[PDB]
C-alpha cells in the first residue's frame, strides 16, 4: 500500500495560502503574492476560485465512478487535511468580522466553511456504497453513485442564486 506524505504537505500549504488571499479578494484590496504560473484563470475575485475549487471536486468524482479505490482514499485524506485549514482559518478570521466587516464579510464565511461540510457527506454516500457493492461488480450501482452526483451540483448551484439576491436587498 502507497500513501501521499509530500504531495498532501504542498497540497495544505496551497490551501493555507487561498485562506489568506482570500476575503481580501471579494473587496478592493492589495494582494502581491497571488501565484498565477501554477493557476488558469484571470483571479481579481473569491468568484472564480470557488468555480475552480466546484470543477477539480466534481472532475476527480468521475474518475471515482472508474473505480479506483486509490484515488479515493487520497481524496479522503485531502478532504480531512482541508477541514482543519479552511474551517479553523475561516473560525478565528469571523472574530475581526463580527465587527464593521460582518456585512461585506460574513455570509462568504457561511459559503466557504459550512457549504464544504454539506458536499462532504453527499460524497461519504457515495464512497460507502460504492466498495461493499464492487464486490458485485454490475451496472446498478454506477447508475445509484452518477444520481447523487448530479444531485450535489443541482442542490449548490440554486441555493447559491436566491442567497445572492438575498445579499443584495439586505438594507
Known amino acids: 500500500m502507497r500513501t501521499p ?7 495544505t500549504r496551497v490551501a493555507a495560502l487561498h485562506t489568506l488571499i482570500g476575503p481580501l479578494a471579494s473587496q478592493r484590496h492589495f494582494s502581491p503574492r497571488f501565484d498565477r504560473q501554477l493557476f488558469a484563470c484571470r483571479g481579481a475575485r473569491l468568484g ?3 468555480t475552480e475549487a466546484e470543477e477539480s471536486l ?4 468521475a474518475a471515482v465512478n472508474q473505480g479506483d479505490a486509490t484515488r ?5 485524506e485531502r478532504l480531512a487535511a482541508q477541514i482543519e485549514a479552511l ?3 475561516a473560525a478565528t478570521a469571523t472574530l475581526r468580522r463580527h465587527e464593521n ?5 460574513g455570509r462568504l464565511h457561511a459559503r466557504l466553511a459550512e457549504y464544504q461540510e454539506y ?9 460507502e456504497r460504492e466498495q461493499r457493492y464492487a464486490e458485485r461488480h454490475d451496472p446498478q450501482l454506477a447508475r445509484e453513485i452518477t444520481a447523487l452526483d448530479e444531485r450535489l451540483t443541482r442542490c449548490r448551484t440554486a441555493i447559491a442564486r436566491t442567497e445572492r439576491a438575498l445579499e443584495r436587498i439586505t438594507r
Open 5 to 11: 506524505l509530500l504531495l498532501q504537505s504542498l497540497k
Open 48 to 50: 472564480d476560485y470557488l
Open 58 to 61: 466534481t472532475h476527480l468524482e
Open 72 to 76: 479515493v482514499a487520497w481524496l479522503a
Open 87 to 89: 474551517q479553523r482559518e
Open 101 to 105: 466587516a460582518h456585512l461585506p464579510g
Open 119 to 127: 458536499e462532504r457527506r453527499l460524497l461519504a454516500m457515495k464512497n
